[PDB]
Amino acid sequence: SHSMRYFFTSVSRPGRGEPRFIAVGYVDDTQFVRFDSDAASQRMEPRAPWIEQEGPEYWDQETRNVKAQSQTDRVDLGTLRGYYNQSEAGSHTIQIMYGCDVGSDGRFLRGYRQDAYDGKDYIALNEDLRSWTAADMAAQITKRKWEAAHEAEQLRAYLDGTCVEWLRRYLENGKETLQRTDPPKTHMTHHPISDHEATLRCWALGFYPAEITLTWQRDGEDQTQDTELVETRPAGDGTFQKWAAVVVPSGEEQRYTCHVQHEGLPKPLTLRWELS
Amino acid sequence: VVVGAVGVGK
């Protein structure tokens, strides 16, 4: 399966300028476009080599589009902040997702559009691509406007036709970049707190897709209460990483194994702590 | 590709 997401952050930055607007776009975890409203240019600067190929018309109309989106956010940062009656001159964000999944064969699967005001939820789209789950007494007003004017209809047309066809095009273009799985190299060691108790840590390094599960198999069961784990860490260079840890008495460490499962990993791996 | 049309305001 594959997806294509468009995150559209818009911080209201009042008084000291003009609403910032970063409009990242993603494909399956990797970024290929960007747009800061304060940078070198006012362009969809490319962010991945396989989109350089597109050519001047593409960048022109993509820039026109994303500046239209930026305009839309700077319009509705004065309506969300108007019904959530919210005190002119205070920072207050808007966030917007899009998407369209496909099958491994390239057939459309699901379409999702999700909006968020200050950190919480707002209107979102169903999985039948036909109605709107307002998540507040403001997203009520939004969904009424979107059920009227059939924004759902236009959006579904976009999603299936345009979003799916360009997604397949991108995966054609990036076929040497996106259709890859990075099997996490596994590494792990212990930090002795004292001569009676210690910690163990299990390292997931270099895996592209941001989905992976680390489990410490404590002698047949996962010691889920003693799982200190960190979030997914962007390794800066497109890959990812994460670790989880547990507190262990000395000697007992031989009763724990780290079990991990990733798309790049056919057989889930066992980490047996080398006593030395 | 970003949504082509000017979308409805939120």
């Epitope: 026109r64 239209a68 305009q71 319009v75 939004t142 009424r144 406007k145 | -």
Partner: antibody
């Protein structure tokens, strides 16, 4: 989200009074009536900037006292009041009764009136 | 401040006479202004809206164009049944129209 108008060709407000317009079609209820006003060859955005809902119904008022916040998204999206019978009582008040997207037709309006220069 | 200057043009639409109208500002836009016919003596009307995305009324024969830099912002008028005082209205920081232009003129040339 494309709509219609209302309001009437009001007659002499020589006693301070009120005026109203009213929507149709879809309910905007979030971004809606605007009451832009004009004189013969100008145009001004007085009280009742986004009024129905989304609050602060004077985004860019720059006038107060007699131009009055009156109504909201009851499907009849404002009823503005003058409180004036001699000074600046001559415009043709309007209603941007389609304001719904940054870029779709803003089916403004067709009417809004005055007293006269005379009284 | 914000000053919308109307850089007009006029006098000629007989049946097909192409006309270009431009407007100037004292602020800087991204890719847009608003446009607004005003038929003589009645009925204000949306027209072309912005730049980088025009959106047109049912008289969909005009072109409103981007300037990037605010040299001006421009419109193209062609036929003679569309004779109205056109206005240049404010975009980039979305003020729901706050500052109008001042007025141009277009007529059929008999």
């Amino acid at each position: 989200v494309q709509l219609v108008e209302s309001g009437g060709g009001l007659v002499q407000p020589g006693g301070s009074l009120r005026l109203s317009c009213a929507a149709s079609g879809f309910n905007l209820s979030y971004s809606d009536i605007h009451w832009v006003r004009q004189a013969p060859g100008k145009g001004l955005e007085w009280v009742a900037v986004v009024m129905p809902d989304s609050g602060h119904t004077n985004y860019a008022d720059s006038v107060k006292g007699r131009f009055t916040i009156s109504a909201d998204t009851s499907k009849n999206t404002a009823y503005l009041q003058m409180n004036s019978l001699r000074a600046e009582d001559t415009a043709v008040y309007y209603c941007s009764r389609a304001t719904n997207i940054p870029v779709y037709a803003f089916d403004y309006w067709g009417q809004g009136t005055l007293v006269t220069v005379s009284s | 401040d914000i000053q919308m200057t109307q850089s007009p043009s006029s006098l000629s639409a007989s049946v097909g006479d192409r006309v270009t109208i431009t407007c100037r500002a004292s602020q800087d836009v991204n890719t847009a202004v608003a446009w607004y016919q005003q038929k003589p003596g009645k009925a204000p009307k949306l027209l072309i809206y912005s730049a980088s995305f025009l959106y047109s009324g049912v008289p969909s024969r005009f072109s409103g164009s981007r300037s990037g830099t605010d040299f001006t912002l421009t419109i193209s008028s062609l036929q003679p049944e569309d004779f109205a005082t056109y206005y240049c209205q404010q975009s980039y920081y979305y003020f729901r129209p706050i500052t109008f232009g001042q007025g141009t003129k277009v007529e059929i040339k008999r």
